[PDB]
Amino acid sequence: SHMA
Amino acid sequence: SHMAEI
Amino acid sequence: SHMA
Amino acid sequence: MAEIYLAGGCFWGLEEYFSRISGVLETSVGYANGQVETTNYQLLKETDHAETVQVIYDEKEVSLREILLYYFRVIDPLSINQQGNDRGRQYRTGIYYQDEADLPAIYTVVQEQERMLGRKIAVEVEQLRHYILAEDYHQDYLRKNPSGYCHIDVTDADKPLIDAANYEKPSQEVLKASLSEESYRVTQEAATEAPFTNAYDQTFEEGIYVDITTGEPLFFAKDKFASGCGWPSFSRPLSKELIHYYKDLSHGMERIEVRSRSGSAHLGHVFTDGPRELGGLRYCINSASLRFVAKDEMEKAGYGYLLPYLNK
Amino acid sequence: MAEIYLAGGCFWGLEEYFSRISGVLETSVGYANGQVETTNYQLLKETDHAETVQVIYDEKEVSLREILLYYFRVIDPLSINQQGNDRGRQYRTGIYYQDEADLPAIYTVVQEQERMLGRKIAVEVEQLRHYILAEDYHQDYLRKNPSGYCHIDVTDADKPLIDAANYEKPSQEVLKASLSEESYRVTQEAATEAPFTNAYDQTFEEGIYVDITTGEPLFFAKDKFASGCGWPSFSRPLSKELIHYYKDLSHGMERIEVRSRSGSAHLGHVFTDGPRELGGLRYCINSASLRFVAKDEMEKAGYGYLLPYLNK
Amino acid sequence: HMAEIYLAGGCFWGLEEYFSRISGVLETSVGYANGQVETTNYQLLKETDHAETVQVIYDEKEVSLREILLYYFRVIDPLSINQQGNDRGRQYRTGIYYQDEADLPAIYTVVQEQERMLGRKIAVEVEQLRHYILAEDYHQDYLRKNPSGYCHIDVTDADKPLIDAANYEKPSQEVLKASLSEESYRVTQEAATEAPFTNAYDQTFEEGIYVDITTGEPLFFAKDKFASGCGWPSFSRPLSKELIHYYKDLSHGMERIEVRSRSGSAHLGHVFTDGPRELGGLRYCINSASLRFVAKDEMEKAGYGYLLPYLNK
Amino acid sequence: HMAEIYLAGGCFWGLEEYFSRISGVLETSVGYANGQVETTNYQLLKETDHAETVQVIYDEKEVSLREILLYYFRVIDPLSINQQGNDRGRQYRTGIYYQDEADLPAIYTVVQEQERMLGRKIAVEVEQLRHYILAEDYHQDYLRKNPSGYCHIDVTDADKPLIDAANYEKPSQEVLKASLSEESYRVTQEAATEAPFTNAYDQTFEEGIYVDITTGEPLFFAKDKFASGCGWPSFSRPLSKELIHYYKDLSHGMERIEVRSRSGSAHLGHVFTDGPRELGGLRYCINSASLRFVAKDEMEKAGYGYLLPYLNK
């Protein structure tokens, strides 16, 4: 997934 | 003689 | 001779 | 009919000013030397044009040199993109020409304008690439919108113009040949003429007094008053820059000597014992250092331009 | 009951400086010649007023000319709207008068300034239109906070004021006929007297050394030191304006020639091999260009105003 | 949630009034910050190296720090050193002082964006807030005591819409070659010109806004669109922001001023100086093919809701 | 081996103190240079027109002329004319005085980079050293003998690391294509993101530095890396140098702030404001695939010797  | 004011 |  | 283009800040004030100078036939305002031949008040900041005043004059009544002098009299020679509060490239100062024939007149004025200030001027000088007429509400803006913004004094257009260049000092050889012995001693050797026996001591005719050694205008007959001191006395010179002051301690006294501007002729001394109502100053001038030019002969003498200021 | 208004940057330092000058009776700071009737330190930046100092003096004790000299000694005369690190029209330089009888004195000092500098100055000269006293927290600011913001050496007001007007240089001819061939060749030419046989090489007596050519004070005895280089040697002149420096490439060497201000007489050279504790400079002067005046004969001569400074 | 940011941009009288008029700001003050001594006042200001600073307390929910910053750069000269308007001196130097050290990422993003668009680093300094000395009482809300007091900035700019270019990045070339109609691509990417009167919006005059077909970035207000007989959509001025346009000198058998969009650099058309003089005299002649009309009604859901308050001046 | 250069940048007290702290500088002295005559001292300075100058003798194999110049440009005002701080006048003008003409291309290349960055011409003058006159002893090492002496500049900047981008030029795109692993290339050049916890440096906490994998440019110190559960290596700040990071606004369904390297404009990751409040509060969430870790003990041999002793806080 992505960085948040 | 010369120019002189008062 | 001059100044030096 | 000649034409030159001047950029000196907000064109509203510059145009009003030039519209008052004698010899000017037509005036208009626009934008010049930008980076494109299309623009208007709203696109100005984008197009880099300079606010410019178009001056169409009678070169036989007023010369390009004179127009330029009037120009330098009202702007700031050293400011960069600014005259008054107005800051920005549209307010950069500049002289745009078309006929590079009058480049010499332009540079002479700039050179001598630079000798005076010392530093080099920020005024821009270049070939007029294009001139775009401004919107109609900008044309003659102050004649139709008095009390409008105006950083300069448009009345300065009335103050007489006395170009020192027209009165440079002749060689010492010719002065010896055209000045009487007394005029030469007083003028070049700081001597003094006898009190009441001089020519203009009791003269009170209409006209002006000129520097005998160069012809440079010095005093108006209207500023002359009787003091009974022995020498012609005036309350002030035509204009402030026509006199140079020097401390004079000779003859066991402490006085202030005065000399003409262009030729540097010793004229006499100035004192502070004059008519309190006239200013309090007394310019005690040797008759031998002056040449009286009457009103009726002023025109031929080459001083027609000062006739309008003779009156009180 | 005599006064003059001076604008020379932040008025704090300027007021402290003038209050310390013999002859000043009272001082106060304010805002002058703006575009509106009134203002305050808040609206200053927008009313176009100039920080000004009011100097009230005793015409008998100190002259308007002397005041202006002390003025030009502490301001940057070519600077436009800036003194020290303060920028803006409120910091512009100006001399504001009330009586027209003060013009000759003012103009004389202004032109002398422009002659010395060879260029027009930025100091403006105009009639006082209106002087608004400044808020009480400004008045006598350094006289309350002895250690406050101040960008001018306030003690310069205590250093001697030598007016060049009092020592006019004689004509080239009157000189060649008045001074020894020795003094003339050395003083008017780049001549240098013999090393040890001159009159002041070994002199160490209370008094002052003057320009043999004009009488302009040059050195205090207290600044003379024992050198044995052959010619009288000083660590420094009375005031810094008194000496002009020039690059001398003559006699196969590169050194610094020294000349007097008024008179521009050749004096000798300056080196950097002088006593360290005294500044390190050695002003090597020819005795032939000086006239020693002992303390005794000082008052009798015209140098009594210098007696208070002979003491270390 | 609420935060604070300190902005120095010249005389604070005009700067505070400006920020008080911004949606989201709830409290402003003025003072002296980052000097060489812990304390000063208006008198010792020029001696203490303090910068006139405006404190801005805002609601992150209504206005972002990024937005406050954009509003800041539109009222100050970014390259000027120690000067704004006619005020010269270090107390007028530009500066963005932060309390919360978490504000950096946003501050830096805005600073570098300004630079990338100017080609050169800006004069605005950004550093930690060392101390903020509240200014005397006569300075606080100065303009809100003297409605016509002195002011070198147009506080009525704070009420002008601000379009954030980030919200409309230029799609990829390829993606454009596929998303745009052959007509729209040729006009937008190659500077072609659509036919005179057959284009879509020549006679369109409905409430709403015209947008950049290539990016979605707002360009003109229907209220600035005027009736022209040239055949192409014509407007008197870009959407209440002259920053939305880039002008270029064009020589296509003539000498004209080409107009392109900020983000996206889309050829839009040309601007002339023959428009209604009562409106500025400008005439932005635009290809309908570079635009996308968005009706007032379908605007909110389109994502241009923030412009609704400006649609009808 | 030895080399020297003469630098003028305001009151020489501060400038001399500053350079005495630079690694590689062997000896310094202050003096007066390029006046109108070969004679002077403090008292004659204003009359002779010399510039207060600092002599810098350095070991060119430890620090380069180029590097001394970069150090010089970080602490002086390059636009200021005849002024630095409160001291105004010609003896305070900035200048770079050289002796060996073969040194000019290096001097001017720094001047040009400095100007391209500022966007305008710098006032610093560069000419041949004509003469240098040692100043009186009380002026030598002034700030050493007189701490609490006048000093405009922060002699502290002398101890901050200097990363010269010129040492880390970005290779051609094809060389990177061939040199990086498919992943590093995707991440670094196409802004992709490596998997959450399977990346190489996520749990790495050994001493040393983290370098841009595309150019070799130093980016982070091990001392600024911290424990995080996000999955990707996290730092509180770029290698003691802000200039090393470019901040860009990013939207990928959300609103973030992306970070890239200075020299290679490589996509590194994103920065968040939820990091340890004691370290500054930020979290530079960085992909491992965009970095090369260089252990403390391999630094010298890897060409990073100059970054020791910046490893300790």
PDB file of N, CA and C in Angstrom, chain D residues 93-129:
ATOM      1  N   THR D  93      13.033  56.280 -16.420  1.00  0.00           N
ATOM      2  CA  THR D  93      13.292  57.524 -17.117  1.00  0.00           C
ATOM      3  C   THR D  93      14.002  57.283 -18.459  1.00  0.00           C
ATOM      4  N   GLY D  94      13.609  58.031 -19.490  1.00  0.00           N
ATOM      5  CA  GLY D  94      14.233  57.858 -20.791  1.00  0.00           C
ATOM      6  C   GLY D  94      13.979  58.919 -21.855  1.00  0.00           C
ATOM      7  N   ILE D  95      14.871  58.959 -22.843  1.00  0.00           N
ATOM      8  CA  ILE D  95      14.796  59.890 -23.976  1.00  0.00           C
ATOM      9  C   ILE D  95      14.832  59.039 -25.237  1.00  0.00           C
ATOM     10  N   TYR D  96      13.725  59.006 -25.976  1.00  0.00           N
ATOM     11  CA  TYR D  96      13.648  58.210 -27.196  1.00  0.00           C
ATOM     12  C   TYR D  96      13.593  59.129 -28.410  1.00  0.00           C
ATOM     13  N   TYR D  97      14.497  58.884 -29.352  1.00  0.00           N
ATOM     14  CA  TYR D  97      14.621  59.687 -30.564  1.00  0.00           C
ATOM     15  C   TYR D  97      14.359  58.859 -31.810  1.00  0.00           C
ATOM     16  N   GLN D  98      14.269  59.531 -32.947  1.00  0.00           N
ATOM     17  CA  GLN D  98      14.022  58.845 -34.204  1.00  0.00           C
ATOM     18  C   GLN D  98      15.103  59.144 -35.198  1.00  0.00           C
ATOM     19  N   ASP D  99      15.458  60.415 -35.246  1.00  0.00           N
ATOM     20  CA  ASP D  99      16.494  60.889 -36.125  1.00  0.00           C
ATOM     21  C   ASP D  99      17.742  60.824 -35.256  1.00  0.00           C
ATOM     22  N   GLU D 100      18.672  59.923 -35.567  1.00  0.00           N
ATOM     23  CA  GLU D 100      19.879  59.823 -34.755  1.00  0.00           C
ATOM     24  C   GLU D 100      20.793  60.994 -35.066  1.00  0.00           C
ATOM     25  N   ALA D 101      20.243  61.968 -35.779  1.00  0.00           N
ATOM     26  CA  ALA D 101      20.979  63.168 -36.133  1.00  0.00           C
ATOM     27  C   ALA D 101      21.069  64.021 -34.882  1.00  0.00           C
ATOM     28  N   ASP D 102      20.030  63.976 -34.053  1.00  0.00           N
ATOM     29  CA  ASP D 102      20.058  64.756 -32.833  1.00  0.00           C
ATOM     30  C   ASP D 102      20.569  63.984 -31.612  1.00  0.00           C
ATOM     31  N   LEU D 103      21.355  62.945 -31.875  1.00  0.00           N
ATOM     32  CA  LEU D 103      21.976  62.178 -30.806  1.00  0.00           C
ATOM     33  C   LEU D 103      23.031  63.070 -30.128  1.00  0.00           C
ATOM     34  N   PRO D 104      23.817  63.823 -30.924  1.00  0.00           N
ATOM     35  CA  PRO D 104      24.847  64.704 -30.365  1.00  0.00           C
ATOM     36  C   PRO D 104      24.316  65.701 -29.345  1.00  0.00           C
ATOM     37  N   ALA D 105      23.181  66.326 -29.639  1.00  0.00           N
ATOM     38  CA  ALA D 105      22.600  67.291 -28.714  1.00  0.00           C
ATOM     39  C   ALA D 105      22.218  66.568 -27.427  1.00  0.00           C
ATOM     40  N   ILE D 106      21.623  65.391 -27.581  1.00  0.00           N
ATOM     41  CA  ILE D 106      21.208  64.557 -26.462  1.00  0.00           C
ATOM     42  C   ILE D 106      22.374  64.172 -25.550  1.00  0.00           C
ATOM     43  N   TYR D 107      23.446  63.635 -26.125  1.00  0.00           N
ATOM     44  CA  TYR D 107      24.592  63.237 -25.318  1.00  0.00           C
ATOM     45  C   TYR D 107      25.334  64.402 -24.694  1.00  0.00           C
ATOM     46  N   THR D 108      25.331  65.560 -25.346  1.00  0.00           N
ATOM     47  CA  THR D 108      26.027  66.699 -24.752  1.00  0.00           C
ATOM     48  C   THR D 108      25.317  67.005 -23.434  1.00  0.00           C
ATOM     49  N   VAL D 109      23.995  67.104 -23.493  1.00  0.00           N
ATOM     50  CA  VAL D 109      23.223  67.385 -22.306  1.00  0.00           C
ATOM     51  C   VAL D 109      23.467  66.331 -21.239  1.00  0.00           C
ATOM     52  N   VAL D 110      23.535  65.059 -21.628  1.00  0.00           N
ATOM     53  CA  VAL D 110      23.754  63.997 -20.647  1.00  0.00           C
ATOM     54  C   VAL D 110      25.136  64.082 -20.032  1.00  0.00           C
ATOM     55  N   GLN D 111      26.138  64.319 -20.867  1.00  0.00           N
ATOM     56  CA  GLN D 111      27.495  64.429 -20.371  1.00  0.00           C
ATOM     57  C   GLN D 111      27.581  65.556 -19.342  1.00  0.00           C
ATOM     58  N   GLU D 112      27.188  66.765 -19.733  1.00  0.00           N
ATOM     59  CA  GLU D 112      27.262  67.891 -18.817  1.00  0.00           C
ATOM     60  C   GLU D 112      26.311  67.747 -17.632  1.00  0.00           C
ATOM     61  N   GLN D 113      25.281  66.931 -17.801  1.00  0.00           N
ATOM     62  CA  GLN D 113      24.318  66.688 -16.736  1.00  0.00           C
ATOM     63  C   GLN D 113      25.000  65.740 -15.751  1.00  0.00           C
ATOM     64  N   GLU D 114      25.947  64.959 -16.269  1.00  0.00           N
ATOM     65  CA  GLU D 114      26.695  64.005 -15.464  1.00  0.00           C
ATOM     66  C   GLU D 114      27.905  64.649 -14.813  1.00  0.00           C
ATOM     67  N   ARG D 115      28.479  65.659 -15.465  1.00  0.00           N
ATOM     68  CA  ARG D 115      29.621  66.356 -14.884  1.00  0.00           C
ATOM     69  C   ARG D 115      29.126  67.025 -13.609  1.00  0.00           C
ATOM     70  N   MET D 116      27.931  67.600 -13.689  1.00  0.00           N
ATOM     71  CA  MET D 116      27.338  68.291 -12.556  1.00  0.00           C
ATOM     72  C   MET D 116      27.096  67.409 -11.341  1.00  0.00           C
ATOM     73  N   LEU D 117      26.396  66.301 -11.529  1.00  0.00           N
ATOM     74  CA  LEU D 117      26.102  65.421 -10.410  1.00  0.00           C
ATOM     75  C   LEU D 117      27.278  64.548  -9.993  1.00  0.00           C
ATOM     76  N   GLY D 118      28.242  64.386 -10.890  1.00  0.00           N
ATOM     77  CA  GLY D 118      29.380  63.541 -10.588  1.00  0.00           C
ATOM     78  C   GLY D 118      29.051  62.146 -11.086  1.00  0.00           C
ATOM     79  N   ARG D 119      28.128  61.482 -10.393  1.00  0.00           N
ATOM     80  CA  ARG D 119      27.684  60.134 -10.753  1.00  0.00           C
ATOM     81  C   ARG D 119      27.034  60.127 -12.130  1.00  0.00           C
ATOM     82  N   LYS D 120      26.968  58.952 -12.749  1.00  0.00           N
ATOM     83  CA  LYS D 120      26.336  58.828 -14.056  1.00  0.00           C
ATOM     84  C   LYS D 120      24.830  58.736 -13.836  1.00  0.00           C
ATOM     85  N   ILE D 121      24.060  59.311 -14.751  1.00  0.00           N
ATOM     86  CA  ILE D 121      22.611  59.321 -14.617  1.00  0.00           C
ATOM     87  C   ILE D 121      21.953  58.021 -15.038  1.00  0.00           C
ATOM     88  N   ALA D 122      20.795  57.737 -14.445  1.00  0.00           N
ATOM     89  CA  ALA D 122      20.052  56.512 -14.729  1.00  0.00           C
ATOM     90  C   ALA D 122      19.116  56.653 -15.918  1.00  0.00           C
ATOM     91  N   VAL D 123      19.109  57.834 -16.527  1.00  0.00           N
ATOM     92  CA  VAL D 123      18.263  58.072 -17.681  1.00  0.00           C
ATOM     93  C   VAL D 123      18.648  57.135 -18.815  1.00  0.00           C
ATOM     94  N   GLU D 124      17.636  56.625 -19.494  1.00  0.00           N
ATOM     95  CA  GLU D 124      17.819  55.700 -20.604  1.00  0.00           C
ATOM     96  C   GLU D 124      17.774  56.485 -21.913  1.00  0.00           C
ATOM     97  N   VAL D 125      18.694  56.195 -22.822  1.00  0.00           N
ATOM     98  CA  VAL D 125      18.705  56.875 -24.115  1.00  0.00           C
ATOM     99  C   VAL D 125      18.762  55.813 -25.219  1.00  0.00           C
ATOM    100  N   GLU D 126      17.784  55.826 -26.122  1.00  0.00           N
ATOM    101  CA  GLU D 126      17.744  54.845 -27.214  1.00  0.00           C
ATOM    102  C   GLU D 126      16.759  55.184 -28.336  1.00  0.00           C
ATOM    103  N   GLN D 127      16.923  54.507 -29.470  1.00  0.00           N
ATOM    104  CA  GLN D 127      16.072  54.698 -30.639  1.00  0.00           C
ATOM    105  C   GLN D 127      14.611  54.334 -30.339  1.00  0.00           C
ATOM    106  N   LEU D 128      13.698  55.233 -30.685  1.00  0.00           N
ATOM    107  CA  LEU D 128      12.280  54.996 -30.477  1.00  0.00           C
ATOM    108  C   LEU D 128      11.865  53.844 -31.392  1.00  0.00           C
ATOM    109  N   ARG D 129      11.547  52.695 -30.799  1.00  0.00           N
ATOM    110  CA  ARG D 129      11.133  51.513 -31.561  1.00  0.00           C
ATOM    111  C   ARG D 129       9.665  51.576 -31.938  1.00  0.00           C
TER     112      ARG D 129
END
